[PDB]
Every structure is written in structure tokens, then in C-alpha cells.
Amino acid sequence: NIRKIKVDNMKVSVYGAGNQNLYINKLNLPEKFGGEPPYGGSRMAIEFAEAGHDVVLAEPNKNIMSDDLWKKVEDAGVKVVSDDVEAAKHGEIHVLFTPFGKATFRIAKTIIEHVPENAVICNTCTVSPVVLYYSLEPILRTKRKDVGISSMHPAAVPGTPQHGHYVIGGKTTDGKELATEEQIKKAVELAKSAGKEAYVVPADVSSVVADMGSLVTAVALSGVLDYYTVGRKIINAPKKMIEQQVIMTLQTMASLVETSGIEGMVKALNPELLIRSASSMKLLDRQKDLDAALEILQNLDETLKAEVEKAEIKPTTLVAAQSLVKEIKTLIGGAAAEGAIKRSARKLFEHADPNSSSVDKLAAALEHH
Amino acid sequence: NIRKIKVDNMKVSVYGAGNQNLYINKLNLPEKFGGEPPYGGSRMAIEFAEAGHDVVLAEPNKNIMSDDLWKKVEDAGVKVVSDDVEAAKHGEIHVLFTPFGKATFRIAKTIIEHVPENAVICNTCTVSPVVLYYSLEPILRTKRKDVGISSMHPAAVPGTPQHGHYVIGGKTTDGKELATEEQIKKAVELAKSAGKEAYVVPADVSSVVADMGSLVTAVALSGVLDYYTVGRKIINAPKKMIEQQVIMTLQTMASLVETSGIEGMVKALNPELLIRSASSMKLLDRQKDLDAALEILQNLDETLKAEVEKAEIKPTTLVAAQSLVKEIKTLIGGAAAEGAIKRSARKLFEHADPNSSSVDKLAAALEHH
Numbered sequence: 185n186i187r188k189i190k191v192d193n194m195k196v197s198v199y200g201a202g203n204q205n206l207y208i209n210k211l212n213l214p215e216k217f218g219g220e221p222p223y224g225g226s227r228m229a230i231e232f233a234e235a236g237h238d239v240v241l242a243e244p245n246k247n248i249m250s251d252d253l254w255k256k257v258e259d260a261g262v263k264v265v266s267d268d269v270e271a272a273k274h275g276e277i278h279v280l281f282t283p284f285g286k287a288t289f290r291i292a293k294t295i296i297e298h299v300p301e302n303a304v305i306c307n308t309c310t311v312s313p314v315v316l317y318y319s320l321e322p323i324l325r326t327k328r329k330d331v332g333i334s335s336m337h338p339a340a341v342p343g344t345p346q347h348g349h350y351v352i353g354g355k356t357t358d359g360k361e362l363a364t365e366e367q368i369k370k371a372v373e374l375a376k377s378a379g380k381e382a383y384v385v386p387a388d389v390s391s392v393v394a395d396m397g398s399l400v401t402a403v404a405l406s407g408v409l410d411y412y413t414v415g416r417k418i419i420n421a422p423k424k425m426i427e428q429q430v431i432m433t434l435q436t437m438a439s440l441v442e443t444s445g446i447e448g449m450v451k452a453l454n455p456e457l458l459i460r461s462a463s464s465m466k467l468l469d470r471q472k473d474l475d476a477a478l479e480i481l482q483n484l485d486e487t488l489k490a491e492v493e494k495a496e497i498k499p500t501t502l503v504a505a506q507s508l509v510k511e512i513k514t515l516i517g518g519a520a521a522e523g524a525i526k527r528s529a530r531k532l533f534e535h536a537d538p539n540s541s542s543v544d545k546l547a548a549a550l551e552h553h
Numbered sequence: 554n555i556r557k558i559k560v561d562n563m564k565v566s567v568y569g570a571g572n573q574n575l576y577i578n579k580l581n582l583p584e585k586f587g588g589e590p591p592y593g594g595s596r597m598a599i600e601f602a603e604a605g606h607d608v609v610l611a612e613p614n615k616n617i618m619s620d621d622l623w624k625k626v627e628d629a630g631v632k633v634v635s636d637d638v639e640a641a642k643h644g645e646i647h648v649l650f651t652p653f654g655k656a657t658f659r660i661a662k663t664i665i666e667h668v669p670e671n672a673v674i675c676n677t678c679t680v681s682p683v684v685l686y687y688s689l690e691p692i693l694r695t696k697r698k699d700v701g702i703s704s705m706h707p708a709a710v711p712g713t714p715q716h717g718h719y720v721i722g723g724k725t726t727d728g729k730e731l732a733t734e735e736q737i738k739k740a741v742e743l744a745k746s747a748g749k750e751a752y753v754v755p756a757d758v759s760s761v762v763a764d765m766g767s768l769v770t771a772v773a774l775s776g777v778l779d780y781y782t783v784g785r786k787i788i789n790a791p792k793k794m795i796e797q798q799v800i801m802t803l804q805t806m807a808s809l810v811e812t813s814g815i816e817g818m819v820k821a822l823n824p825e826l827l828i829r830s831a832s833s834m835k836l837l838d839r840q841k842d843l844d845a846a847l848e849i850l851q852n853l854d855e856t857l858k859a860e861v862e863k864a865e866i867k868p869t870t871l872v873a874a875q876s877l878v879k880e881i882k883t884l885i886g887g888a889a890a891e892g893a894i895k896r897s898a899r900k901l902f903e904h905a906d907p908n909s910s911s912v913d914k915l916a917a918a919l920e921h922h
């Protein structure tokens with residue numbers, strides 16, 4: 185353990201101290217969840233320095249944290265810098281605890297130019313590893329073939345008792361390696377050296393189980409498993425029938441949200457009807473997920489009916505996504521198909537809109553002359 | 554009400570008496586849910602005859618119900634026949650309480666040839682209205698432009714107290730009319746005349762809220778609404794961010810099931826990790842859906858780990874379906890795009906495999922000579 189850490193002790197660079205006002209004031213984590221500030225990136229840095237690593241924390245904004253919190257960071261042995269280039273030249277592992285949007289991609293492009301050989305660039309919850317890879321792909325493929333992309337996603341707020349793990353993005357479900365095994369193993373080593381359980385998951389799936397949306401994934405998964413058990417044990421429906429129903433429902437809901445938002449999706453799937461319909465699926469003594477859902481739909485039903493009749497169901501073409509991917513790959517086949525897929529994959533995983541806001545364009549024009 | 558029924562009293566044809574052994578013995582509905590046999594199609598026929606309509610029930614298999622149950626049907630005033638053609642020539646509304654697979658499409662093709670002018674053909678849970686329309690489309694477009702497609706989906710087992718409603722398929726989310734307003738209004742009239750609440754929903758969505766999969770839809774919907782409320786009230790995340798997370802999660806889960814089944818999907822989305830990750834989303838005093846899900850995942854976790862390591866994550870290309878539909882419509886655009894979409898829509902909604910089983914081909918070859 186300690187003897188092993190000495191052999192594998194490495195240089196680590198964390199980018200982004202974490203928005204402490206968000207953690208302490210808006211979320212009130214010390215009272216709601218536990219622990220003590222700082223939280224986030226600066227906390228990950230403290231934990232890695234506490235584990236014996238040479239940690240550099242790159243934060244350009246000194247006012248994001250009070251001076252007392254900064255001392256906690258400095259007292260841990262973390263070297264704070266304001267220049268990303270200084271931190272890029274340092275680590276062999278770079279954790280992006282950076283803001284949603286342009287900032288994460290801008291910093292990733294700045295560091296890939298100065299990272300040491302075989303370094304790995306790790307995302308957190310503000311970006312998907314797939315989208316991070318797509319943005320650095322031209323450099324990764326030609327200039328830096330040695331650089332790897334993975335995750336060091338806390339899937340929790342570092343500094344809270346809930347943070348006892350890390351999600352590390354591995355080979356994708358489409359069989360694509362964004363990083364070498366050695367680089368992924370080094371990410372696992374870093375995680376475990378800070379007393380955190382290391383979870384290596386397909387990179388494309390990491391966001392789905394690590395981000396705030398994991399709430400929807402957990403709930404929906406329990407519904408799928410409840411239905412799967414009822415379907416096979418009580419209904420004795422064939423597995424392919426149960427699978428067809430699961431895909432049909434989950435895919436319809438995603439696509440309605442995609443075109444018409446949550447409100448429009450609720451307008452298409454009537455909660456009142458769903459309560460009545462799903463009630464004939466109460467076939468077991470304990471279906472706590474179904475009972476909880478029906479009461480939630482029932483309680484929210486009166487309030488929902490108001491805004492949903494204001495909502496609009498925008499044109500939706502409900503299709504089975506993988507089946508449609510397979511068809512374009514045979515109808516079109518090649519590079520044209522690759523582009524249409526990469527763009528649809530990016531639309532699914534992009535956390536922030538890549539295009540500049542109307543104000544940004546107007547502000548730039550105001551300062552033009 | 555009664556005076557109104559006399560003006561709108563109409564001829565009704567129900568196809569399929571309902572598998573009584575399933576309802577009474579395998580499901581034991583009299584004791585588990587309530588009511589008295591018969592259930593299903595023959596019950597829908599009784600209720601429609603009880604409402605004053607001239608009902609014909611077409612059932613080729615007399616042994617599907619005991620003689621006492623048949624008397625209940627005959628005593629209601631329902632004319633039982635064994636020839637579908639005799640019932641097709643009768644009603645102006647045809648309800649398909651037929652078996653999963655080939656049988657439903659075969660009967661629908663037999664009746665469209667003899668249905669009276671302006672008749673409407675209604676599906677139940679064994680077929681999707683979209684797939685039913687696709688199978689009769691060449692005849693509907695050329696010979697019978699007057700015929701309409703809709704649903705008379707009980708979204709419950711007729712004969713149980715839970716059956717107090719009907720889902721009637723209306724214009725699709727893609728803005729397509731499978732039936733005229735008058736035909737849909739007649740379906741609503743038939744439903745309401747039997748004391749049932751009429752729910753008109755987009756035809757493509759009807760299965761998602763009416764079928765056994767409504768269990769998954771209800772649960773997942775409560776998870777989405779829980780996350781939506783937490784996201785906006787506690788996290789104060791923008792709506793587009795909440796929407797992105799909802800789509801990303803629901804679409805990933807559907808696609809994993811599509812390529813790798815439930816087991817493979819559970820192998821990709823680690824339940825143990827999800828429990829830990831989703832626990833940092835317990836931001837409100839009451840989140841009964843999340844708490845129920847975490848205990849279900851926790852209880853099922855030990856059992857799942859056994860078969861999931863046996864499971865395989867088959868190649869999956871995660872993309873946002875609607876975004877990918879929009880791209881093929883501009884890259885390809887025309888008829889080629891229509892075909893690829895109609896086929897992907899059919900794969901999503903088809904309840905049974907359209908292709909003949911290996912045994913069927915082998916049996917046919919055995920009786921060839």
C-alpha cells in the first residue's frame with residue numbers, strides 16, 4: 185500500500201478549484217450532505233496530495249475561494265498556479281474540473297500542446313469523454329498519438345462522505361479505445377491511492393452513470409428490472425417481448441424530450457392515463473418503485489395538466505436508434521455515415537451548447553471598434 | 554345518454570374471445586384483481602352489447618372458453634361466429650383482440666376486403682397501430698381510402714375493476730392521420746357508451762402508455778419529473794441541461810437493451826455504481842422513487858452480478874435518434890430515407906417477430922410431400 189504508492193507516486197495536475205459558493209451556499213453541502221469546504225477540484229487536489237502525489241492545481245480566478253480555504257489547499261502540499269501551461273507541463277494525469285462549455289475545450293486544447301509523453305487527460309462531470317475526444321481528435325491522431333482520454337469523474341461532490349468512488353472511462357461500447365490500458369491502470373492507481381473505489385466503465389456510458397442524470401438512470405433501471413421480473417415470473421412473456429417493450433418505452437420518452445422537452449413529453453404521455461394503465465401491472469406483493477411512481481404522478485398530476493396544455497408536441501419520428509444506425513451504415517456505409525453518427529453522438533453527449541450565444545455575438549460587435 | 558345512444562347505436566365486431574386460461578389460471582385475475590370471467594375480447598363484446606350495440610364476436614376456436622362462459626356471452630346478446638368474413642361485413646368498428654404475430658395481420662387483411670364503407674379497424678395490446686397501418690397501407694392507399702386505423706386498447710384486462718378506460722389512437726406525433734376525426738369520434742362514442750373514459754393519444758405513443766411496458770413508462774417518468782424538480786429547484790440547472798441529461802440517460806438505456814438485452818444493459822450500467830452515484834442526488838426530503846430504486850438495485854445487486862458477468866455488451870453506437878433522423882432526411886432526403894425510417898419505426902413498435910420461426914420452416918418442409 186504505502187510501499188506500492190512510493191513506486192507509483194506520480195505528478196498530478198487538477199484544473200479548476202471548484203465553485204465554492206455553489207457547494208457551500210447554493211447547495212449548502214456541509215449541512216445537507218456533510219464534510220467541510222473546500223469541495224470539488226481543490227478537494228480532489230488535497231486528497232491526491234494527501235496520498236503523496238506531486239499535485240499542481242491550476243485556477244486563474246483567486247476569488248473563487250476564500251483565503252482560509254486556499255490555505256487548506258496550500259497546507260496539503262498542492263502547488264497552486266494561475267497558468268494552465270505551467271500545470272500542463274507538470275502532470276502525467278490531468279483532471280479537468282473545469283466549467284461547462286467552451287472553457288473545458290479551450291483548456292484541454294491548451295494543455296495537449298504541452299503535456300508530457302503518455303499523459304492522460306481526464307474529464308469530470310462538465311464534459312463527456314466522447315465529446316472531449318472528438319474536440320482533440322485531429323491532434324490526438326496526428327501530433328500526440330501517445331496522449332490518452334479517460335475520466336476521473338467523482339460521481340459525487342469531492343469532500344462529501346458520498347464521494348468514495350471514481351468513474352474511469354474505458355473502451356467504449358462501440359469497441360473504441362480512447363486510452364491505453366497502462367493509462368487507464370494509472371487512472372485506477374490514482375483513484376485507489378486516495379482510498380476511492382475505482383469503477384472502469386465504457387467511456388460513452390460514464391456520463392449516464394456518473395452525472396446528475398444518474399438519478400433518472402437509477403429510477404428507470406429499477407422500473408426495467410421490476411417489469412422484467414413481473415414479465416417473466418407472472419406474465420411469463422418471452423424475453424424478446426419484454427426487451428421490445430423496454431426499448432419502445434425508453435426510446436419514445438427520450439425522443440419526445442428531444443423534440444418537445446419534458447413538458448411536451450408529458451403532454452404526449454398522459455400521467456393520469458399512465459396511472460390507470462400501470463395499475464394493471466401491480467402483479468407482485470412488493471413493487472415499491474411502481475407505487476412510488478403512481479403517487480408521484482398522482483400528486484404532480486393536477487399541477488402538470490396546467491402547463492402541459494400550454495406545451496406543444498413538436499414533430500417526432502419515433503424509430504429504434506441502433507436499427508437506424510445499422511441502416512445508414514449499409515445505405516450510405518462509409519465516411520458520410522461516420523459524420524452523421526459522430527454528429528448525432530455529439531448531440532446526445534454534449535453537456536453545453538457549442539455555438540456562441542446571441543449576447544456573446546452582440547457583445548463582441550459592441551467591442552469590435 | 555340513453556337517448557343519445559339510440560341515435561349513435563352502431564354495429565360492432567370484436568375479433569378474439571380472449572385466452573381465458575391465461576386470465577383465470579395463469580394470472581388468476583378473479584382473486585388477484587377482481588371481477589368474474591370471461592375477460593378480454595369476449596368481455597369487451599358483452600359490455601358493448603350491454604350498452605345496446607349489435608355486437609358480433611368472431612372466434613374460430615370454441616374450446617378457448619368453457620360452455621358456461623360462452624353462455625354469459627350469448628346471454629348478453631353477442632352473436633358469436635367462427636368466420637372472420639361474416640364479422641367483417643357487419644361492424645363499422647372492428648376491434649382486434651387477436652393473437653400476437655401473424656394472426657393479427659392475417660385477420661386484418663381478411664376483414665379490410667369485406668369491411669363496410671368508412672369502417673375503422675382498431676388494435677388492442679397485441680399490435681401497434683403504426684405497424685397495423687404499415688401492413689394494410691397498400692390497400693388503404695389504393696382500394697380502401699375510406700377505412701381508418703385507430704385503437705380500442707383497454708390498457709387493462711376487460712372484466713377487472715381496473716378496466717375503466719380505453720386508449721384510442723389519434724394523429725401521430727409525426728403529424729400523420731391514420732383515421733378521420735369522425736372515425737375517432739365514433740371510437741370515443743363506443744368507449745364512453747360502455748361507461749369507459751376515452752383517452753385519445755398519438756397513435757405511435759398509444760402502445761407506450763397502454764401496454765404492459767406502461768410499468769416502465771410510469772416509473773421512468775416519475776424519475777424524470779423527480780430529477781426535473783431537483784434540477785431546477787435545488788441545482789438550478791438550466792432546462793436545456795436537464796433535458797440533455799434526460800435524453801442522454803433514457804436513450805443510452807434503450808440502445809443498450811436494443812443491442813445487448815436487459816442483462817447486457819445492466820452489465821454496462823453498474824447497479825452498485827448507480828447506487829453510489831444516484832445517492833448524491835438525494836437533495837429533497839421526499840424522493841420516494843429514488844429511495845425505492847436504490848433499495849431495489851441494492852437487493853437485486855448480489856443476484857445481478859452473477860449473470861451480468863455472463864452477459865456481453867454487443868457493439869453499440871450511442872446517438873440521439875431524432876438528430877440522426879433529421880440528418881438522414883437531409884443527407885439522403887427522399888424515398889430512401891422514408892424506407893430506412895419506416896423500417897426503424899417498425900423495429901421499435903413491432904410486438905412479435907414478423908419472420909417465420911425455424912420450426913415453422915422445418916414443419917412446412919416435413920409436410921411438403
Ligand SMILES: [Cl-]
Pocket residue numbers: none
Ligand atoms: Cl520553460
Ligand SMILES: [Cl-]
Pocket residue numbers: none
Ligand atoms: Cl353474402
Ligand SMILES: [Mg+2]
Pocket residue numbers: 444445446447448792796
Ligand atoms: Mg422542458
Ligand SMILES: [Mg+2]
Pocket residue numbers: 423427813814815816817
Ligand atoms: Mg435479456
Ligand code: NA
Pocket residue numbers: 268290291294
Ligand atoms: Na487556456
Ligand code: NA
Pocket residue numbers: 637659660663
Ligand atoms: Na382470416
